[PDB]
Design a protein around this ligand. Structure first.
Ligand code: 5B8
Length: 128
């Protein structure tokens, strides 16, 4: 499975090194630069619970998902994960609940202590 591969081959990109955000590069991006805090980032993504449930994709609404990086506009995994990406990169992220919705979850969609899996493509990033 796409999740287990991240469990097995993924790099722990967390600061505390608690394996709470694991990353695999599936497609290498351009050049060397990676986004700054406050950069307006554009992505397409596909995501779901680790168990395959609650699938969501930006593609099926024909629009890039946009947010400001490192400002807490998204789950912690996304701020940590997207900051490591190069433009045009595609990566897979496995995100423990501590770096997503925690014990509370977000009902009715996200249950308590859900692990989330994402495929993220970094389309672009520009300055604050
Ligand atoms: C830690 O801080 C948090 C900050 C925000 C949220 C709200 C959810 C946030 O979405 C997410 O963080 C992730 C990553 C981005 C894609 C959507 N996300 C999801 O979990 C979605 C799915 C959950 C099921 C698995 C597949 C993804 C959820 C919204 O249905 C989300 C959803 C929709 C929009 C959004 O922000 C748009 C960016 N800006 C926000 C201010 O207005 C300008 C746009 C952000 C939760 C947080 O933690 C519990």
């Amino acid at each position: 499975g796409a999740p287990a591969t991240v469990t097995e081959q993924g790099e722990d990109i967390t600061s505390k090194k608690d394996r709470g955000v694991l990353k695999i590069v599936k497609r290498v991006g351009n050049g060397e630069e990676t986004p700054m805090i406050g950069d307006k980032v554009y992505v397409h993504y596909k995501g779901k619970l680790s168990n395959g449930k609650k699938f969501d994709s930006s593609h099926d609404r024909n629009e890039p998902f946009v947010f400001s990086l490192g400002k807490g506009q998204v789950i912690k995994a996304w701020d940590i994960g997207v900051a490591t990406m190069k433009k045009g990169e595609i990566c897979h992220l496995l995100c423990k609940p501590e770096y997503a919705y925690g014990s509370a979850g977000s009902l009715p969609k996200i249950p308590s202590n859900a692990t989330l899996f994402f495929e993220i493509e970094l389309l672009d990033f520009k300055g604050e």
